[PDB]
Design a protein around this ligand. Structure first.
Ligand SMILES: OC[C@H]1O[C@H](OC[C@H]2O[C@H](O[C@@H]3[C@@H](O)[C@@H](OC[C@H]4O[C@H](O[C@@H]5[C@@H](O)[C@@H](OC[C@H]6O[C@H](O)[C@H](O)[C@@H](O)[C@@H]6O)O[C@H](CO)[C@H]5O)[C@H](O)[C@@H](O)[C@@H]4O)O[C@H](CO)[C@H]3O)[C@H](O)[C@@H](O)[C@@H]2O)[C@H](O)[C@@H](O)[C@@H]1O
Ligand SMILES: OC[C@H]1O[C@H](O[C@@H]2[C@@H](O)[C@@H](OC[C@H]3O[C@H](O)[C@H](O)[C@@H](O)[C@@H]3O)O[C@H](CO)[C@H]2O)[C@H](O)[C@@H](O)[C@@H]1O
Lengths: 1266, 147
């Protein structure tokens, strides 16, 4: 609290705090009056403690104590032998006695200067002694620097002496040379028999190629010394590898028998069958089919990998421990590989096992960048945040034909982009979300999704011959991440089977909702005839801004009205604005009399996936239970975190760190709004963790009352107003929102009676008053009014719910509540101070007062008419007549509004401790309870068997390890028993438990909603080889990635023996016979109808768009660098292997001939049309003819390269010895300078910066303007 | 231990001799390391949702301000944007940022105390001026106006 400009702290006790206090982990102080101290020193006990100027938090400073400076730490101890920075960012060093050092000093091996007051000189020169020394900006350490004396640059070394006949730096990082006279040199200079190039400024240029002595000259990256680049830098001549061991280690066979493989290809951890085995390191013996050995014992992709293998295996006791490099001779490495092979066979005999080796190879393989995620470009922006990035599979019939999709895989066909017309913009859908993304643009897959849909809508019929245990409707998960055809497919299915387009009674018997977050989805859904209900994020959003989020600065309640709906916000005139910038809330409620058609919708305050998952994890992070949001956690870890979350939720202080504010007030509005189907979140009713329905939340009573009141009173028209005109509040204004419903046939304030002369209205209707300001106090004059309407003149009303300083009181019946009577015009008038009387006769006192406690931060009052019958029902039944010929399914009206959906699960529930406490068992016993709260549809969690802790590569997701059912391997397994007969429940119970749960809900007149999850599937056990490109969520290639059309081992193939195999495609034939039009109707995104001619009993890559990155590497599938062809052994007519393995002679190295230089890879093949790196790290390009590209005298060294590997296409600068220039400037034959990047490519049309803070500009044609 | 290489770049090697990567706390200091294990110094960095500035020589996490669109914004040491509060920049200037995140200017009364911010938005301390038409000295400690 703030009093007279000062912070005071008032305890949980209610006591004002003085003295030193650690409050919530921060050390602070308050003087005798209780005010807090900031930017000052205080003395407590033996400590001299400074407190910060912003926060008032204890930290280090320097005080002038008496006449002298003395340093202090956070705890208030005098510091000795240390450095302290003071309030103004100045630095002292205090010695062994606590006294600050002055003058020149050597501290921790560093030279530093201190002024006469003990302050450290930083970022300037300083005349200590005869010499002048520069001291660095942040360290303050002595360093070489240059300054301008007269008009000429001069150099100063670290000792403060001027530099003569030598090179010296400046702080920025530029090197200069200064001659005998001290003067900086320029241009081309030969000193100590070596030649350096200094630019016009005098900067020494390193890694710079230029024609300097009329003959090319490359200036060293190390020292800038000019070499002629005539000497070849490759150190490996052409050598033969074959020897006495070659025929023994060669493969027994060139096929799947002798080679571990995937779709014919080989992998880094492949093992093969050699012809013979050096058993025990003694005697070569023919191999038996079980004698498999690792390919890396005998072959390597390149010398670097070979050297790394030798060093790694050496470290494990297998030979002389070695430092080998790619520069080591090939002959040496091969000899060393054999002594390791010997040692290996000895440890195989000694251990009588090869498992130890499997683990050694696996370990070694993950060490190498090409075989781990370092070549996968892990990224976390956008949806990549979930799992680290995506790979899009490609159609490549030449290399990977099993994986070809038949020209499907249209990505990002979300509703707004169903036809691809926004593919080039951000309007393209984020097709990739999680795990293996199913290709819902493929007609065959579309048919399979319909089969699954049929299976769910007839679950009970099919699995228990129980026609009462069937789901009634669906929730469509992740609409914006799949092909929008699925909506039409689902819509048309329900039309065909249930005649949902015939009547509101048919439609409303199968309530179906969409998870459709895009702000333009509502209008799409409505153009397509509302086959499923859109969400209304606009109201959920406004709850966030005005009530639910944040302790203080909240949007005004005014924003709920959306007055812009009317021209000039003319609430007097009420002219609807026919043309607006596509904005505002979906349904206006200022004066909604049901006269204008509106888009039917569901709405909510929270969800299993909204305002839950993030807070619950932030809480775990905040208490050090995990480090990252993507971090894997155990259920025990979750339970501990949950305890902090609950503690925060129920905090009597009223402050909430992770949880949402004002949930009751939010539900009061959600549950009284016209033209919406409200949805209630299990986790606002019961605690989100632990056991299902284990313990109610503090909000439960209030929400329960609102729910029951909704059945009795909520009908008719609506109005909504605020004591507020905009962002800013005038003097009297409270910003208190007043929402009213009138009764069954009453549509307006001024309507006094129904047209049909029904009397139902008189005891119906409701009044809601809500505020978002806990510190709200009314002026004494101020009156606040609820216009209950002219159909309710002089009527007695009683409170349902009233907020106060300790909680919110809930009144169950007319007798126990305060009454108040409306006037002749039908208004309930409220003042700052009120005296209400019970109908009994008792008098009650009540202030219109903002309150702050666990249940509210603001005001909440709800009022209902007294005299309500016990069985009073204000709901409207849906009519069987064909009311509309518009073609649409759902219509927003009184009937639809009479529904309430309950989202009845939480992602963070604990696993059942016993079968009796399984969610679906509990639902069956408690069905009664939900009927009486007015739930007409029960949204059950997804019932599919969780993929669990299974993880074939890449990052696991919480859906999977929390077993919530959104992550599954088998789409048709909803809790079936193991094949041995044992029970095998999901998190929610067996399949019988589910059928019982569904039946129980029908016995209590409620529907059951199936969560339809078509976007992805997790943890498929079978491997295939795909052609993959690294992409972002929309399937766009990452800008700077080498990972393009590469072969990759993915987990895409289903077991083939699961419930997907049993029930896959089975119901389609029966359906085509009975409803032919479903199978003949064309879909929009494809132009085709769904295709039931092919059944999906087993998933595989051809039906997938892609996957999250699996951490295997860009080149885990083995390839020859020289030809760029991948090794394969599937068909004996098209085998490609390294020549060693076929007992042929593999020659490897560089060899010159009259025409030029050639290169042979470790596998014995000639490099053509490919880049090659030598053992010293230099790069070369070999042209289509097989010859190294090299610059000639008088010719342009810049060459344009078009390779088989497209990503490398570009302009390169090859020197006379063929070395590609990288990360440096290169001069062409005509004097123009270009720059070439990390990978050798020319850079165009941008500014480029230097480590020394030099800037250069490169024109569009590549040249450097600088 | 820390080691700086030939080019003046810095790594930290752990108990096994392997360099640390990503966000780390060392000697009680928060620091970031790129995918190659190199230490980020003198720049912003999007680690998680938050954006954090790391100091030029220490590389330690600190509050800083950057210009987003055409308006100065404030970033704290944890990488969260600053709203309704004072925040520094690396140079040493203090600013105040309102509920909307926007830096304030001129004479401002917040939490019943009065501060003077110049045209650039710098909080002025140890500054004497006739501000409310009556003399006012702005504190050397916190910049709060006394009479
Ligand atoms: O223009 C001067 C008037 O400004 C205020 O009036 C705002 C309007 O209020 C009523 O309609 C609103 C309707 O706009 C919408 O508001 C949602 C949301 O708005 C604010 O949050 C925004 C946030 O969405 C985001 O905006 C980004 C930009 O989006 C578009 O490009 C906009 O055109 C642009 O202006 C936005 O900047 O980020 C913004 C910055 O952080 C943020 O401002 C507001 O803070 C939230 O509380 C609010 O939920 O839906 C509301 C219902 O939910 C409607 O009530 C009026 O009908 C409309 O005419 C107004 O223009 C101000 O109050 C008026 O007094 C000014 O005259
Ligand atoms: O931090 C505890 C440690 O501090 C001293 O060690 C310093 C070390 O911190 C470093 O100083 C560089 C630089 O850092 C601060 O920002 C300071 O303001 C600035 O003046 C300082 O120059 O480098 C030196 C070199 O070894 C170290 O000595 C203490 O000496 C040590 O005993 C403390 O434990």
């Amino acid at each position: 609290e703030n009093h007279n400009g000062y912070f005071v702290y008032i305890d949980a006790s209610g006591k004002q705090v003085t003295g030193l206090q650690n409050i919530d982990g921060n050390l602070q102080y308050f003087d005798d009056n209780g005010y807090q101290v900031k930017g000052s020193f205080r003395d407590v006990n033996g400590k001299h403690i400074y407190f910060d100027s912003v926060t008032g938090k204890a930290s280090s400073n320097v005080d002038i104590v008496n006449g002298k400076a003395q340093g202090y730490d956070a705890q208030g101890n005098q510091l000795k032998k240390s450095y302290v920075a003071d309030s103004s960012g100045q630095t002292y060093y205090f010695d062994g006695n606590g006294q600050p050092l002055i003058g020149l000093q050597t501290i921790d091996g560093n030279l530093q200067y201190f002024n006469q007051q003990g302050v450290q000189i930083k970022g300037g020169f300083q005349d200590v002694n005869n010499k002048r020394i520069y001291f660095a900006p942040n360290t303050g350490n002595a360093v070489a620097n240059t300054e301008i004396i007269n008009g000429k640059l001069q150099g100063r070394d670290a000792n403060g002496n001027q530099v003569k006949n030598a090179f010296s730096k400046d702080v920025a990082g530029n090197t200069f040379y200064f001659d005998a006279n001290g003067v900086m040199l320029t241009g081309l200079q030969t000193i100590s028999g070596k030649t350096y190039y200094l630019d016009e400024q005098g900067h020494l240029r390193k890694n710079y190629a230029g024609t300097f002595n009329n003959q090319f000259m490359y200036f060293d990256a190390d020292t800038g010394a000019g070499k002629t680049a005539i000497e070849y830098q490759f150190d490996q001549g052409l050598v033969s590898q074959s020897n006495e061991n070659t025929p023994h280690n060669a493969a027994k066979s060139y096929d799947k028998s002798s080679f571990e493989n995937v779709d014919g290809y080989l992998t880094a951890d492949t093992w093969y069958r050699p012809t013979d085995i050096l058993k025990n390191g003694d005697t070569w013996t023919a191999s038996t089919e079980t004698d498999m050995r690792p390919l890396l014992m005998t072959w390597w992709p390149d010398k670097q990998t070979q050297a790394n293998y030798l060093n790694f295996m050496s470290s494990k006791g297998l030979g002389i421990t070695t430092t080998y490099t790619a520069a080591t001779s090939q002959k040496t490495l091969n000899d060393a590989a054999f002594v390791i092979q010997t040692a290996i066979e000895q440890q195989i005999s000694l251990k009588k096992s090869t498992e130890w080796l499997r683990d050694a190879i696996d370990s070694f393989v993950k060490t190498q960048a090409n075989w781990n995620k370092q070549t996968e470009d892990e990224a976390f922006d956008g949806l990549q945040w979930l799992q680290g990035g995506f790979l899009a599979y490609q159609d490549d019939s030449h290399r990977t034909p099993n994986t070809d999709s038949g020209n499907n895989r249209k990505l990002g066909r979300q509703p707004i982009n169903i036809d691809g017309s926004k593919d080039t913009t951000d309007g393209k859908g984020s097709e990739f979300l999680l795990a293996n993304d199913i290709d819902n643009s493929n007609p065959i897959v579309q048919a399979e999704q319909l089969n699954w849909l049929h299976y769910l809508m007839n679950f009970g019929s099919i699995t228990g011959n129980n026609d009462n245990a069937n789901f009634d409707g669906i929730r469509v998960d992740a609409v914006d991440n799949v092909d929008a055809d699925l909506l039409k497919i689902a819509g048309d299915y329900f039309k065909a089977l249930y005649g949902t387009d015939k009547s509101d009674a048919n439609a409303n018997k199968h309530l179906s909702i969409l998870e459709d977050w895009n702000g333009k989805d509502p209008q799409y859904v409505n153009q397509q005839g509302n086959a499923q209900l859109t969400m209304d994020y606009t109201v959920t959003s406004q709850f966030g801004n005005s009530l639910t989020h944040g302790a203080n600065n909240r949007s005004n309640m005014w924003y709920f009205l959306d007055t812009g709906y009317y021209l000039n916000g003319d609430l007097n005139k009420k002219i609807v604005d026919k043309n607006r910038p596509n904005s505002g809330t979906l349904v206006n409620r200022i004066a909604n009399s049901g006269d204008t058609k509106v888009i039917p919708n569901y709405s909510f305050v929270r969800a299993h996936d909204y305002d839950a998952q993030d807070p619950i994890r932030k809480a775990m992070i905040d208490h050090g239970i995990i480090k990252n949001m993507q971090d894997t956690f155990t259920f025990d870890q979750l339970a501990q975190g949950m305890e902090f979350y609950y503690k925060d939720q129920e905090n009597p202080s009223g402050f909430k760190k992770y949880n949402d504010y004002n949930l009751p007030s939010a539900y009061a509005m959600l549950l009284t709004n016209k033209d919406t189907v409200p949805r209630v979140y299990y986790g606002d009713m019961y605690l989100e963790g632990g056991q299902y329905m284990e313990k109610g939340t503090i909000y439960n009573p209030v929400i329960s009352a609102l729910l029951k009141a909704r059945i009795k009173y909520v009908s008719g028209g609506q109005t909504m107003a605020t004591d507020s005109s905009g962002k800013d509040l005038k003097d009297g204004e409270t910003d208190l929102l007043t929402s009213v419903r009138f009764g069954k046939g009453i549509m307006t304030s001024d309507q006094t009676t129904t047209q049909d002369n029904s009397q139902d209205y008189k005891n119906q209707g409701i009044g809601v008053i809500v505020g978002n300001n806990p510190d709200l106090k009314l002026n004494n004059d101020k009156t606040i009014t609820l216009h209950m309407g002219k159909a309710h003149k002089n009527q007695l009303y009683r409170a349902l719910v009233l907020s106060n300083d300790s909680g919110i009181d809930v009144y169950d019946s007319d007798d126990k509540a305060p009454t108040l009577r409306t006037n002749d015009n039908g208004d309930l008038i409220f003042h700052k101070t009120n005296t209400f009387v019970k109908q009994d006769g008792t008098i009650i006192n009540y202030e219109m007062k903002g309150s702050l406690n666990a249940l509210i931060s603001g005001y909440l009052g709800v009022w209902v008419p007294v005299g309500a019958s016990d069985s009073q029902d204000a709901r409207t039944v849906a009519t069987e007549s064909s009311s509309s010929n518009d073609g649409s399914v759902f219509h927003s009206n009184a009937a639809l509004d009479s529904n309430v959906i309950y989202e009845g699960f939480s992602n963070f529930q604990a696993m059942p401790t016993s079968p009796e406490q399984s969610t679906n068992v509990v639902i069956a016993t408690k069905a009664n309870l939900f009927k009486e709260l007015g739930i007409t549809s029960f949204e059950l969690a997804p019932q599919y068997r969780s993929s669990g802790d299974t993880n074939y590569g890449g990052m696991s997701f919480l859906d999977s390890f929390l077993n919530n059912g959104y992550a599954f391997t088998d789409r048709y397994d909803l809790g079936f028993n193991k094949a041995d007969g044992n029970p095998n429940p999901t998190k929610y119970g067996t399949d019988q438990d589910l059928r019982n749960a569904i039946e129980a809900l029908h016995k209590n007149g409620m529907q059951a909603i199936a969560d339809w999850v078509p976007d992805q599937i997790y943890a498929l056990p079978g491997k295939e080889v795909v052609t993959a490109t690294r992409v972002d969520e929309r399937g766009n290639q990452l800008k700077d990635t080498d990972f393009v059309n590469l072969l990759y081992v993915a987990n895409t193939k289903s077991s083939g023996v699961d419930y997907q195999a049993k029930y896959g495609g089975e119901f389609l034939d029966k359906l085509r016979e009975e409803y032919p039009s479903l199978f003949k109707q064309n879909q929009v995104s494809t132009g085709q109808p769904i295709d039931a001619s092919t059944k999906i009993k087993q998933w595989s890559a051809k039906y997938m768009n892609g996957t999250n990155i699996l951490h295997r590497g860009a080149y885990y599938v083995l390839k020859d660098w020289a030809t760029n062809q991948y090794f394969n052994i599937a068909k004996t007519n098209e085998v490609f292997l390294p020549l060693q393995l076929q007992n042929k002679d593999a020659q490897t190295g560089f060899i010159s001939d009259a025409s030029g230089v050639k290169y042979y890879s470790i596998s014995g093949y000639q490099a053509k049309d490919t880049f090659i790196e030598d053992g010293n790290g230099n790069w070369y390009y070999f042209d289509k003819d097989g010859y190294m590209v090299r610059s000639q005298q008088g010719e342009n060294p810049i060459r344009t390269v078009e390779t088989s590997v497209n990503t490398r296409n570009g302009n390169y600068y090859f020197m006379p010895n063929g070395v590609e220039l990288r990360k440096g400037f290169g001069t062409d034959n005509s004097g123009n300078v270009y720059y070439f990047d990390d990978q050798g490519k020319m850079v165009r049309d941008k500014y480029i910066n230097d480590d020394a803070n030099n800037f250069y500009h490169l024109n569009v044609d590549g040249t450097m303007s600088r």
